[PDB]
Paper text:
[name] is a human gut symbiont wherein the ability to degrade mucins is mediated by an intramolecular trans-sialidase (RgNanH). RgNanH comprises a GH33 catalytic domain and a sialic acid-binding carbohydrate-binding module ([name]). [name] displays the canonical [name] β-sandwich fold and broad specificity towards sialoglycans with millimolar binding affinity towards α2,3- or α2,6-sialyllactose. [name] binds to mucus produced by goblet cells and to purified mucins, providing direct evidence for a [name] as a novel bacterial mucus adhesin.
Protein ligand complexes were achieved for both 3′SL and 6′SL. Definitive electron density for the Neu5Ac and galactose residues was observed in the 3′SL and 6′SL complexes. Contrastingly, for the 3′SL complex, only partial electron density was observed for the glucose residue in a single monomer, and the glucose positioning indicates that the lactose points up and away from the binding site, without further interactions with the protein. In the 3′SL complex, the lactose positioning would permit further extensions to the carbohydrate chain as would be present in more complex or anchored glycans, whereas these may be blocked in the 6′SL complex. This would provide a degree of specificity towards sialic acid linkage. Notably, the carboxylic acid group of Neu5Ac forms electrostatic interactions with an arginine dyad, Arg204 and Arg128, mimicking the coordination observed in sialidase active sites. The C4 hydroxyl group hydrogen bonds to Lys135 and Glu126, the N-acetyl group sits in a hydrophobic pocket formed by Tyr116 and Ile95. The N-acetyl group nitrogen interacts with both Glu126 and Tyr210. The affinity of the interaction between [name] and sialic acid ligands was further assessed by ITC. Both 3′SL and 6′SL bound with similar low affinities, with dissociation constants of 0.57 mM and 1.70 mM, respectively.
Numbering used by the authors:
A (entry chain B): 7 to 105, 111 to 196
B (entry chain A): 7 to 106, 112 to 195
């Protein structure tokens, strides 16, 4: 099963929606691998909108976070960061989703294969293999989980507006076939 | 054989070294796929140092370029950009090289397989697959090739300092085994 799930969460641009106190959030804050699946509708023209983030929101730690994000040009991406000297692993895919319309995206991080895969609307859109595999448990001082933005020194960065229709986070690594199916209509 | 090669080029921080007029530069400016192999020594503490770039250096086109870069913290990466709405395909690998010392890195971009692979000092360090494969020929208005920085609105960005010991650009997609051997 999922370790954290939410449904029907509408977010006013800029505000975010804090998940840090939810049952399961502690698990999400320590993930060594796993899968994130999100259905959403954006109503914002912000250039970078985090759907889900997990990171360190404290002063001086603004480059220590993970987020799965969309853009105002129909892009989908993620960033996994613990300051640039430690790691900055990113995917950014163009023309993968559309903006008002429901989309479903997913990211998996697979420790055994050292691989990250991004899916949108029933398609695998990118794969990253890194010799030095990292995930959330490698970020230093993770203290929050949020929908619709990323906490950076107490400010909601990369603000989303619209609806998080469904969000599920898994410790399990779903198969590509599963993610093609679950991100479809 | 390479389509563009240079050896023994010193570059001070900020200066760059223009290759735009060299025979073969036109080919580099239009690559649909290929391989870049560079041996270098950095003397600079700049956080992002382009070893080789190919892009559009004109005003308002600062997000239209390709570069293969190293960092002050022993990292290696690349960015391939034509404005973020079009594409922004990147790799960034930590603790892959050392400043201390000569290092050799390589990037291949394989159109058939829609794949980019980065190598450093005899190891494959990252692989990127993109559904929408892009390379230099997809960048709009490419007008320069340089060593040791990236031209952005007439300024040398991401400035390298040190020596480009050997730089080769190929239209061919070299094998992983070839790259493991040449970089190690
Ligand atoms: C998702 C993404 O591309 N994020 C970038 C981020 C954004 O480009 C920016 O916040 C708004 O578009 O920029 C990051 O880098 C910044 C640097 O480019 C800038 O020189 O200095 C900034 C600090 O004032 C900041 O470090 C960022 O916000 O961390 C890098 C990130 O990948
Ligand atoms: C290799 C890399 O991370 N390149 C980044 C670049 C560098 O982080 C930065 O130039 C070094 O200081 O930052 C880029 O994004 C910038 C935005 O973060 C910033 O909000 O606005 C800047 C323009 O005034 C700039 O766009 C960049 O320089 O393009 C993104 C790039 O991937």
């Amino acid at each position: 099963g999922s370790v954290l799930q939410k449904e029907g969460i509408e977010i006013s641009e800029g505000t975010g929606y804090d998940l840090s106190k939810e049952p399961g959030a502690a698990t999400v804050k320590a993930l060594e691998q796993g899968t994130i699946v999100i259905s959403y509708k954006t109503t914002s023209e912000n250039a970078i909108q985090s759907l889900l983030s997990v990171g360190n929101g404290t002063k001086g730690n603004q480059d220590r976070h993970f987020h799965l994000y969309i853009t105002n040009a129909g892009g989908v991406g993620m960033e996994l960061r613990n300051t640039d000297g430690e790691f900055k692993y990113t995917l950014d895919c163009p023309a993968a989703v559309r903006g008002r319309v429901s989309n479903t995206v997913a990211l998996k991080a697979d420790k055994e294969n050292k691989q990250y895969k991004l899916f949108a609307n029933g398609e695998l859109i990118a794969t990253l293999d890194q010799e030095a595999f990292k995930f959330i448990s490698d970020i230093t001082g993770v203290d929050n989980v949020m929908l619709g933005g990323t906490m950076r020194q107490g400010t909601v960065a990369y603000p989303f507006g619209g609806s998080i229709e469904r969000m599920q986070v898994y410790r399990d690594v779903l198969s590509d076939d599963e993610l093609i199916a679950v991100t479809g209509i």
